[PDB]
């Protein structure tokens, strides 16, 4: 008695794995060496981004199975292979328990290039949308009730760093702790800050001697809020201990970052030392030239640094912490090195959906 | 109560609204599906204009389906196909007043091509090949 009727243009989306473009806001005239790539793959942005807001939808966000961090991992490798060209690279090949590996020596020209990050967007073609979770107390996975449809995001500044989150996105209400599975002891716990921890970090007029001042009281109250938040998930009676590191490579046993093309390796031994129960710190940085690569397995040595004082002030906005599960108190040492987790903290609240505007429903029509 | 007229909720809006309310505003969504307007070596349109062509092609692909289940007076038409019980056997008071389109297609996504092939073949070979016999006299 009831007949099927077709409908074109119903608000229905599915989970896709499409490829987005960037569309950042470059100037196409400078030689900042981000803006060369930031014009090379990016069209200029729009002046009026749309912020259409939905009413009753509840959508399941996921963080650690997101298909945007691999798109991050492709184009940031493409950007770092053009912007900062090192002098000599050593990449093993190991052509085929019976195997031997040989290393090559690729040598290219290495001029001194300026390096300062530029905030970029990631925008989708027609037929797609990005759902965005507006909850100020988002756990990280599962349902979000205040889902808003977005053309494309805010500016993400691609700062390669370890042991911390530098120039990130600040939290709304409180300090958030995001983890796929607590009491698993094998996954990096990402922690966002609700306030920016300002730090000066400079090399003044031995060229490989840089000192790095961070305020004591602001860091103390920030980690007061942090250890307040870790007691939520651990029974409200455990002692919290912050160690420095546990061996490893120089880019993971120390806070490794970049500043004007200079490759900073600052020690954080006196920065994570307190034990918690129920004026300025200086960091002994050492500027190096023979570094390890995160894009692939290998070595890279670079030109000697330029002459003069170098300045870069920055805002500390997060943490990569890792538990030391034993057999009582809890030990939390800083870690990192996985860059997919480095840009998962700023792409945690986004999801790419594909629209399918063709539905069918039973109604009572004929001819 | 008093009124001033309807409103504009935006593109992809009212996805959490009811079925009969979201079926009222298909025109605004279908107009945005095509979008349009827009208005050194420096050739980035090799990417960008590419995307534009893709969008146009996508519309034609959907148009092809809506051209071949032949109504072409779009956003609403009807066919002569009765439903089958394996495709979410629900009644009208379940299906038209109390859920959105997301929860409908979330369960009809299992049965996409099995109804699309039947709507492809049945009326389009049965409403055809009979008016030629009716044109004999």
């Amino acid at each position, epitope marked *: 008695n009831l007949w099927v009727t077709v409908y074109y243009g119903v608000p229905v989306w599915k989970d896709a794995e499409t490829t987005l473009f960037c569309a950042s806001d470059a100037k196409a005239y400078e030689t900042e060496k981000h803006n060369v790539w930031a014009t090379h793959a990016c069209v200029p942005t729009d002046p009026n981004p749309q912020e259409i807001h939905l009413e009753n939808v509840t959508e399941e966000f996921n963080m650690w199975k997101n298909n945007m961090v691999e798109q991050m991992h492709t184009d940031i490798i493409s950007l770092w292979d053009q912007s900062l060209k090192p002098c000599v690279k050593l990449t093993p090949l190991c052509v085929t328990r019976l195997i031997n590996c040989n290393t090559s020596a690729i040598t290219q020209a290495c001029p001194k290039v300026s390096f300062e990050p530029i905030p970029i967007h990631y925008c989708a073609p027609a037929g797609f949308a990005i759902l965005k979770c507006k909850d100020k107390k988002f756990n990280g996975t599962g349902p979000c009730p205040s889902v808003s449809t977005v053309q494309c995001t805010h500016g993400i500044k691609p700062v390669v760093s370890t042991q911390l989150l530098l120039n990130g996105s600040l939290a709304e209400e409180e300090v958030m702790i995001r983890s796929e599975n607590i009491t698993n002891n094998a996954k990096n716990i990402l922690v966002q800050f609700n306030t920016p921890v300002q730090i000066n970090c400079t090399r003044p007029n031995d060229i490989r001697q840089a000192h790095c001042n961070v305020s004591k009281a602001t860091w103390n109250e920030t980690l007061g809020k942090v250890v307040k938040q870790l007691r939520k998930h651990f029974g409200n009676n455990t002692i919290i201990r912050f160690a420095n590191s546990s061996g490893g490579d120089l880019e993971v046993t120390t806070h490794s970052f970049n500043c004007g093309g200079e490759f900073f390796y600052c020690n954080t031994s006196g920065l994570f030392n307190s034990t918690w129960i129920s004026d300025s710190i200086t960091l002994p940085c050492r500027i190096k030239q023979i570094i390890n690569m995160w894009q692939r397995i290998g070595q890279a040595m670079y030109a000697p640094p330029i002459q003069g004082v170098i300045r870069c002030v920055s805002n500390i906005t997060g943490l990569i912490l890792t538990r030391d599960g034993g057999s009582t108190t809890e030990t939390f040492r800083p870690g990192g090195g996985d860059m997919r987790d480095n840009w998962r903290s700023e792409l945690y609240k986004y999801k790419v959906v594909k629209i399918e505007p063709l539905g069918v429903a039973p109604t009572r029509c004929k001819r | *109560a008093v*009124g*001033i007229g309807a*409103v504009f909720l935006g593109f992809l809006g009212a996805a959490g609204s009811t079925m009969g309310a979201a079926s009222m505003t298909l025109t605004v969504q279908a107009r945005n599906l095509l979008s349009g307007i827009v208005q050194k070596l420096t050739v980035w349109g090799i990417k960008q204009l590419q995307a534009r062509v893709l969008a146009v092609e996508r519309y034609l692909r959907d148009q092809q389906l809506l051209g071949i289940w032949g109504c072409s007076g779009k956003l609403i038409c009807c066919t002569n196909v009765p439903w089958n019980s394996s495709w979410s056997n629900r009644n009208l008071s379940e299906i038209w007043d109390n859920m959105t389109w997301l929860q409908w297609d979330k369960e009809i996504s299992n049965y996409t091509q099995i109804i699309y092939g039947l709507l492809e073949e049945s009326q389009n070979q049965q409403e055809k090949n009979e008016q030629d016999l009716l044109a004999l006299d």
Partner: antibody
Amino acid sequence: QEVLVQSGAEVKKPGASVKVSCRAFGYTFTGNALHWVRQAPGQGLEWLGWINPHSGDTTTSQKFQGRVYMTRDKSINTAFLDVTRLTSDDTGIYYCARDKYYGNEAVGMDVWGQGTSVT
Amino acid sequence: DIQLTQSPSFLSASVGDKVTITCRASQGVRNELAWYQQKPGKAPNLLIYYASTLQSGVPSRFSATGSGTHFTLTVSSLQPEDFATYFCQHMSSYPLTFGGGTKVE
């Protein structure tokens, strides 16, 4: 998250005009109608008018017909209220309120701003 | 116009009491009245739309009944944050008028 932000307090002489702006955050401005309501100090609530932000259509009370004018701007999501020919009776707090607007008719005013004091 | 009379004008009660406040409309308004709460110095916030339905975020201790011209707001148990000024306002016809207001203490 859903919030209306008004402008600061303004003091004017009688016979002048006063303009107050109300900006929306947290929701789509073109989908909900907007009311204006005034409270005299020590008195009750007096309704003023209500506007569609989409079509620009207005509806004004007949007591203040031709004296208060209501406009909109969709580019910055702001509505403007113009009250002309002021007397001492018009001093009070001006509030912009988002209509809940179910079934394309007036239902209730759920999201209210912080207020503007006009003397 | 349509005039709304609220009774009583000033009510006195203790913490934990059940109270009922009556809004009377001069004309037939069906069920198109809404109930609001205002603290002094702050904006009014909505409790009841459609004269019987609870607004999301309002606690369940409040209720509202009525039809025609006779309308009641009922608080089952008074809390110290509930001591404020209550209003009724309609939308059946132009112009919109608010009630006189009921201050509870």
